[PDB]
């Protein structure tokens, strides 16, 4: 290819958009935006598929055009906008508010979350740098560039953007014994506590995570998103809280909780 690629064939779309392998040759390629397309979620997928509020492409276009979708307090009238992790989608119709958090199967689950907390958003600090005229600034995972941050905010840390002014409200410092979320690999959706963070001089940090069920795994640091203090998450965790029940345990859940 000579230049950028602008088509996403259906099989090549991520298995987390988890579309239908039939009924279409192509899949919505997310336009450039705040999130990686492999990690993001187009608005058309979130509305037509996840919510079923629409039926097809024209309906999603009509929905977005009339300015009822509000991604993080902004309209975002483009069909393939990459609404990524921890973004907030507001529909004044049905007065509903969603926050995108992976369900433990590892998918962008529909999370109806309250209006009061929908005012703010969480973010991971991916860079802390000194821009022109000696002005410190911080780059989050959304690509948001927050100017004049707290002087002791470091990389891999987490922050609580007020999402109205777009400035820093509070922040959480990365360290052991801290509630944490996972955003990549087999451990998608898993939530736990940081037990240890082995350094590995030369690259590719690893952290060990122990969840409430007392199960333990290990994940890359790029893959990690501190979410609060144990017992006190800073957001509303989805149904199941990412315990990753075993397949037999899931079968027992299906058998036990069963009413028809």
């Amino acid at each position: 290819a000579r230049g950028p690629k602008k088509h996403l064939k259906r099989l090549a779309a991520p298995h987390h958009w988890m579309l239908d392998k039939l009924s279409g040759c192509y899949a919505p390629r997310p336009s450039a935006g705040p999130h990686k397309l492999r990690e993001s979620l187009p608005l058309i997928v979130f509305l037509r598929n996840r919510l079923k509020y629409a039926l097809n492409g024209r309906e999603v276009k009509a929905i977005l055009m009339q300015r009822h979708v509000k991604v993080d307090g902004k309209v975002r009238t483009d069909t393939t906008f990459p609404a990524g992790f921890m973004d907030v989608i507001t529909l004044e119709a049905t007065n509903e508010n969603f926050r995108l958090v992976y369900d433990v199967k590892g998918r962008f689950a529909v999370h109806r979350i309250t209006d009061e907390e929908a005012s703010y958003k969480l973010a991971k600090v991916k860079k802390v740098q000194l821009g022109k005229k000696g002005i410190p600034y911080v780059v989050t995972h959304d690509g948001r560039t927050i100017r004049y941050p707290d002087p002791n905010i470091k990389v891999n840390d987490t922050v609580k953007v007020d999402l109205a002014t777009g400035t820093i409200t509070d922040f959480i410092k990365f360290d052991t014994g801290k509630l944490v979320y996972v955003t990549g690999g087999r451990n998608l959706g898993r939530v736990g506590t940081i037990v240890h963070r082995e350094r590995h001089e030369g690259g590719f940090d690893l952290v060990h995570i122990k969840d409430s069920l007392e199960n333990t795994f290990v994940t890359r640091l790029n893959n990690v998103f501190v979410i609060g203090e144990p017992g006190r998450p800073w957001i509303s965790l989805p149904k199941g809280k990412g315990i990753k029940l075993t397949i037999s345990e899931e079968r027992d859940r299906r058998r036990a909780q069963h009413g028809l």
Binding site: L11, K21, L22, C25, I247, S248
Partner: protein, 182 residues
């Protein structure tokens, strides 16, 4: 360029195609259950071979192993739900002991014959093929409809069929019209 959907073969002809004893056994099973071809016996043997392959693979695995537990009891419950494996022997070692005749027995053909609403096996075949038997107010024109245990109690002639109560049909209606005219 659209994503293909996977067709897959469902039978396997035997390597020795000309075995006298095997041919006689196949004809016995065809005549006992009114099978149209001998591809039916091949299909049931292929299904049984897949089942046995899964059972033996799970048997090789160690006892009390999550794979063994999960898929072994999944296969057990599926087979008892079909009805071929009796509830007495849900052990995954009697799964290897099933015979092709066992799956043959659960066909909607033989079930309609057993219930007695069809008095002959070929009568059951034709009655199924004439859109008469309905498994839960839903007709099945297919002899190989594997009747499961939970639903065998709901086989009867459909309402749209004359047997379940409706207009008789072409020949009877024509004869009645002829009698009324003359």
């Amino acid at each position: 360029p659209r994503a293909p959907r996977t067709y897959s073969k469902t039978y396997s002809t035997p390597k020795r195609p000309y075995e006298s004893a095997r041919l006689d056994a196949e004809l016995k099973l065809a005549g006992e259950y009114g099978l149209k071809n001998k591809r039916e016996i091949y299909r049931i043997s292929f299904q049984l071979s897949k089942i046995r392959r899964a059972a033996r693979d799970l048997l090789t695995r160690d006892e009390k192993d999550p794979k063994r537990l999960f898929e072994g009891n999944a296969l057990i419950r599926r087979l008892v739900r079909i009805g071929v494996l009796s509830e007495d022997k849900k052990k995954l070692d009697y799964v290897l002991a099933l015979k092709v005749e066992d799956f043959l027995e659960r066909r909607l053909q033989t079930q309609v014959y057993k219930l007695g609403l069809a008095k002959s096996v070929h009568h059951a075949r034709v009655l199924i093929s004439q859109r008469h038997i309905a498994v839960g107010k839903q007709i099945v024109n297919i002899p190989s409809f594997m009747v499961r245990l939970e639903s065998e109690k709901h086989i009867d002639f459909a309402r749209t069929s004359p047997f379940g109560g409706a207009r008789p049909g072409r020949v009877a209606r024509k004869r009645a019209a002829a009698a009324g005219g003359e």
